[PDB]
Write an enzyme that holds these catalytic residues in place. Sequence first.
Site, short mmCIF file in Angstrom:
data_model
loop_
_atom_site.label_atom_id
_atom_site.label_comp_id
_atom_site.label_asym_id
_atom_site.label_seq_id
_atom_site.Cartn_x
_atom_site.Cartn_y
_atom_site.Cartn_z
N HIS B 10 -2.84 78.66 26.55
CA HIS B 10 -1.16 78.34 26.03
C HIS B 10 -0.59 78.67 27.17
O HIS B 10 -1.08 79.98 28.33
CB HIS B 10 -1.14 78.82 25.21
CG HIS B 10 -1.73 80.62 25.60
ND1 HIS B 10 -0.74 81.51 25.83
CD2 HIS B 10 -2.37 81.39 24.70
CE1 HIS B 10 -0.85 82.80 25.77
NE2 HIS B 10 -1.69 83.08 25.48
N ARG B 61 -0.26 82.61 19.23
CA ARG B 61 0.41 81.50 20.58
C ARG B 61 -0.12 80.35 21.03
O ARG B 61 -0.31 79.66 21.04
CB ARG B 61 1.17 82.16 21.98
CG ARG B 61 -0.41 83.35 22.31
CD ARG B 61 0.22 84.15 23.37
NE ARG B 61 -1.10 84.65 24.29
CZ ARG B 61 -1.14 86.56 23.68
NH1 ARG B 61 -1.37 86.62 22.69
NH2 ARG B 61 -2.24 87.33 24.41
N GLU B 88 -7.98 86.62 23.73
CA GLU B 88 -7.84 87.07 25.59
C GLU B 88 -8.81 87.77 25.21
O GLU B 88 -9.00 89.04 24.62
CB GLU B 88 -6.17 87.02 25.35
CG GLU B 88 -6.27 87.85 26.59
CD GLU B 88 -6.93 87.05 28.52
OE1 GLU B 88 -7.65 86.23 27.60
OE2 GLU B 88 -7.00 87.81 29.14
N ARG B 99 2.29 93.78 36.09
CA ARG B 99 1.18 93.44 36.81
C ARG B 99 1.77 93.11 38.23
O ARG B 99 1.08 94.04 39.07
CB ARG B 99 0.10 91.72 37.36
CG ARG B 99 -0.02 91.25 35.70
CD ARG B 99 -0.31 89.70 35.60
NE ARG B 99 -1.03 88.69 34.81
CZ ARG B 99 -0.41 88.49 33.38
NH1 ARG B 99 1.49 88.95 33.42
NH2 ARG B 99 0.05 88.68 32.32
N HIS B 187 -7.24 81.58 25.65
CA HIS B 187 -6.93 81.88 26.75
C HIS B 187 -7.16 82.15 28.11
O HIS B 187 -8.33 81.72 28.64
CB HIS B 187 -6.87 83.50 26.21
CG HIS B 187 -6.23 83.41 24.92
ND1 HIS B 187 -4.19 84.03 24.50
CD2 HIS B 187 -6.55 83.72 23.56
CE1 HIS B 187 -4.65 83.61 23.05
NE2 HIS B 187 -5.56 83.75 22.77
O1 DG2 Z 1 -2.61 88.15 28.21
C1 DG2 Z 1 -3.60 87.95 29.73
O2 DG2 Z 1 -4.38 89.06 29.80
C2 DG2 Z 1 -3.69 86.62 30.23
C3 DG2 Z 1 -4.03 86.85 31.27
O3 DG2 Z 1 -3.71 87.48 32.33
P1 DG2 Z 1 -4.73 87.83 33.09
O4 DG2 Z 1 -5.93 87.80 33.56
O5 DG2 Z 1 -4.66 86.26 33.57
O6 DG2 Z 1 -3.66 88.17 34.56
O7 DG2 Z 1 -4.21 85.95 28.94
P2 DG2 Z 1 -2.78 84.58 27.45
O8 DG2 Z 1 -2.53 85.73 27.14
O9 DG2 Z 1 -2.27 84.13 29.20
O10 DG2 Z 1 -3.33 83.31 27.07
#
Ligand code: DG2
Lengths: 255, 254
Positions: B10, B61, B88, B99, B187
């Site tokens: 997403h 989401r 995720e 980050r 995710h």
């Molecule tokens: O929430 C998360 O940690 C991200 C990934 O972060 P990164 O590993 O790319 O820093 O997953 P998303 O919610 O965008 O599907």
Amino acid sequence: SKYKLIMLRHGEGAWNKENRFCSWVDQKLNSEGMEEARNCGKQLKALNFEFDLVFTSVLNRSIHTAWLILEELGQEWVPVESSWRLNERHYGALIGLNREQMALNHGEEQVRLWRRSYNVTPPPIEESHPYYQEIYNDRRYKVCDVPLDQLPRSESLKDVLERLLPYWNERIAPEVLRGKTILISAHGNSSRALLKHLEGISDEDIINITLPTGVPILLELDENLRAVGPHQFLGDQEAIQAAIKKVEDQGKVKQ
Amino acid sequence: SKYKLIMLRHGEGAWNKENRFCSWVDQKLNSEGMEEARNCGKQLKALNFEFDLVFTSVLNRSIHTAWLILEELGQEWVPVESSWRLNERHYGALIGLNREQMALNHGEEQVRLWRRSYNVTPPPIEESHPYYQEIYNDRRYKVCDVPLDQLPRSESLKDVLERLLPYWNERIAPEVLRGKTILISAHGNSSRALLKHLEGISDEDIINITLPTGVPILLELDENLRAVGPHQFLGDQEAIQAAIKKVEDQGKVK
Ligand SMILES: O=C(O)[C@@H](COP(=O)(O)O)OP(=O)(O)O
Ligand SMILES: O=C(O)[C@@H](COP(=O)(O)O)OP(=O)(O)O
């Protein structure tokens, strides 16, 4: 024990603002209908409802209504199942026609029979009808539990119950008996058909029942899945009664 | 290709502007994230995709992304199934942290390791964490196929694959073999996990795979459900390449 579930009819669409039978034509909700769905969600949230399963028709206005409610509740993860058996009654050749125009052309009495009677069947929709193709060429009807050519071309309320009842008994009723909190996002006449069954309303009396749009319908059932009492409407009763009258008046000649 | 399936992550969520690790926190898509979903649906419609089943995580989401896609396709009737196993990667204690700030304080390479490593497990989220209660008190995890106290508190990409593989093997894989056209709305890291498996990507190579958001990922499988070739991003490669750099840049200073 007793069991409670929520049933509701989706809100406004462009065609009902024009007072036209929509039925199986896959029209989307309009802004108003979308808001009505959100309001239903807020009321359900106020009562702290926690749904376990949601059943809808395959008409997108029914599905979008459910999605809007789940979003208001923060319950988008709740399982949803959609079936043509919850579809609004098939109005056949009357699809797309103006209800008041029909009252003028055939009289209010006839229109009331077509809209609310139990046994009267609307004239079937033919291939020449303006909305025939749009309906029967859709893939959703190619994958139902009944062949495309076997789907109805028009339905009396009795016809609706005959195809809806099996779905209720086999896939919804069992969840109710398991104590699950269920939301049924249906339509005007598919909802009336289910209510007629659960409340044991007579073939005669069902003609006088009209359901308002975008209004949660409360129904409590006993151990035998029979209504413990008449269905109720959640909200401002005067406004709900007025909305019921507006629906009735759509089939009446001006005065 | 005997079988084809679409997977995607997403778009932007409510914490994207702040560039904070969202993970298991149930934040909604922001305006841009919604558009990314719509554009995905338009791209899929242009390619005649007709789905028979959709799988999502239990994070809203991901579900909303699927709904927006289905609407663009006029396929809102297609069955949807959701599971925490597609959630995720659980970022543990790192949930809620910025980050870039972490990159500043610990070094870009350190943050890159935490984000893309296959074996490194983030520190577990503790009851004292600002978003602990909000996660483990949610009813969606009370009705999981695993006891509440058994749900992870942090996950390495390897841990993610370990709890995702069972779901693929038991629920998704069979459907694909039946000829059904599937859409997986997942995710950033759960998607990386499934790709590693399906494409037989090595523990080392998987570290260099960063997925762009709102981009349909086409995977062509054989009779054994093994990728016949590398995954294919559907759209303009240059724009897709930039979308990838955007994700990588989330961990870079400035
Ligand atoms: O929430 C998360 O940690 C991200 C990934 O972060 P990164 O590993 O790319 O820093 O997953 P998303 O919610 O965008 O599907
Ligand atoms: O047939 C339709 O279009 C209406 C009912 O119309 P009436 O039978 O009340 O005239 O059902 P809805 O789509 O609003 O749920």
